[PDB]
């Protein structure tokens, strides 16, 4: 019956959604705080998903080059999966596990604030990213699920990794959107106080 | 204070979850069984949306044309927002308010469904795509919130309306996330038992 | 110097101009009448190609959901690149062979026909892409470049073959713009004699 | 007949690339140092267009942040047409005319380089993001053809106008793809010598 998985599906939902908030309150502030700190260096944020999650990624920098609830002037953000020709340029020319890391090599700036996204934390093209980012002092902010994934062992805490206490991909894009309209909110009421 | 603000986020999201658990319960279901019957009716589902909530409607199309859970060959669905060269070169031929009216005209079958979505309910993109649909014989599943909008009086059923009880744009699109993903669990539990 | 390496790109442009014209008359000619008895079949143009020549791909379909020259109501064409959420979907989930192929064995209906775009003619991508419209009854128009590639060896003639005389691929991209706009103009001025 | 308005395409378009070269000699080789300069000043290089011209704007970053011919690092270089998520947010939120020049106001450093196209000359936001990079010390390269539009008058010369001699869309598109291939061999060659 149709019904019940619908209701399954809001089940799951609101307890994984409590589950993150019980637990991803710190990891989340201090990516604000990251960011907040980046913006106000002078710098940008660059984000990257992997498949849909890549519609999060540019659903991200959409709400900062333009904006979330409080309206203010465009705030630099970048997003590595809008850039299609050069994706498909890069995914082909002619390899796709460089598409995102090729990207920060050309754009990443000295304190900048790479916004990686990975539902799996098993995205190559976003370790790669990651990867690159590292190379350049450039802090993370990992949004994850599972168990971090490859991800993981690739950070330190200039960094943060954001660990979505879920195994259903479903349920850990639900919550990354929840953290990342969280993070906009503290963009908002901490650089522009309305 | 950052942490207080960001549980905020995670209440309010899980309140409304739960509101709209409660009230869109059978909306979903009958607009779950309309997509199943036009994907074995031959036809197509069309996705659409305003913003970053276009986003959305690119990430159900990509769970249909690809996979979701459930390995499957690819289900015919297409997303409007998709087509840069196109909403560029109608948003500006040389004006925006028929970028997606005019794929639906021309891509447009008899028995495909519209996927329209749209928080505040009065995109006027989206709005004309659904004037445009209900011209073709075209059932509608409207992802709505607030109080509908413009969008509500465009109706009859052969469509069905998905209204968020919420006023607040970021959990309009949470909850949206949250009833593609069960949209696409009925598919594929249904068209493909696994 | 600049100024003559300027001139070297212009002078080897017009040359490959010259040559395409001298010999892809009549192939161009043929994918024109395929392409008009295709839209007046009731069914659509499916486009693709590789990189930068995914912009072109793009670049006619949108000329096509919109208008070229001559004000008309916009035909039905799909863009196979123009879908983020998908490729990225699809290129991962999780390897991007299959990018256009799924796409296709989805969308396509039995009348479409394939406007392949390829340079090298040797990208996966866009050759399994073809190997998939065979498979349904789909004419192909092939736009490439060198000896043709895999694609030459793909195709009987309910299809096409349209080969730039170039060894350069910024010199094919050139010519291939031409090609489009020339059957734009062929379907502008077939079906809608303005 | 199709046959003989397929080679007046290509006779008009050789007929425009000829009088290009001999006209655009100059102003390119400017945009081309211009463009040389910005990269070796730590800076990227910022594209948008119109339409399917868009397309073309892609395709050159795309050149950039990966390869031409001559194989190198990525330069840095962005579109402004690739973002969806932010125009779509932009070109409604809600209103189009201003999707690249808030991009240019948030992205734009000191030092970088607008590379704007526009076959009329006349398209809004086009001209609106000249007019955001000229109040930010940036030079503008444009790429127009007709009379050159309004755009004409909003250029001193730390910035270089390429007006192509043509009152076609379709051979003005042609001609601009020579340019920007011209450019990228011209950074190639010079950044690069292999």
């Given at each position: 019956h149709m019904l019940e998985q619908i209701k399954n599906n809001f089940t799951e939902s609101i307890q994984t959604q409590?589950?993150?908030s019980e637990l991803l309150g710190p990891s989340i502030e201090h990516a604000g705080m990251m960011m907040v700190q980046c913006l106000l260096g002078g710098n940008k944020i660059i984000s990257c998903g992997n498949g849909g999650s890549?519609?999060?990624?540019?659903?991200?920098?959409?709400?900062?080059?333009?904006?979330?609830?409080?309206e203010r002037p465009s705030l630099p953000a970048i997003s590595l999966n809008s850039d299609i020709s050069t994706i498909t340029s890069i995914a082909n020319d002619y390899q796709y596990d460089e598409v995102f890391s090729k990207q920060?090599?050309?754009?990443?700036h000295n304190g900048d604030?790479?916004?990686?996204?990975?539902?799996?934390?098993?995205?190559?093209?976003v370790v790669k990213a990651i990867e690159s980012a590292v190379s350049r002092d450039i802090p993370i902010i990992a949004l994850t699920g599972f168990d971090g994934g490859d991800i993981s062992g690739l950070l330190g805490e200039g960094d943060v990794e954001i660990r979505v206490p879920s195994?259903?991909?479903?349920?850990?894009?639900?919550?990354?959107?929840?953290?990342?309209?969280?993070?906009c909110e503290i963009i908002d009421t901490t650089l522009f106080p309305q």
């Open positions: 409590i589950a993150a890549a519609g999060h990624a540019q659903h991200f920098c959409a709400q900062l080059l333009n904006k979330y609830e409080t920060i090599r050309a754009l990443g604030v790479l916004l990686a996204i990975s539902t799996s934390g098993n995205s190559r093209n195994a259903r991909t479903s349920r850990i894009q639900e919550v990354h959107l929840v953290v990342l309209h969280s993070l």
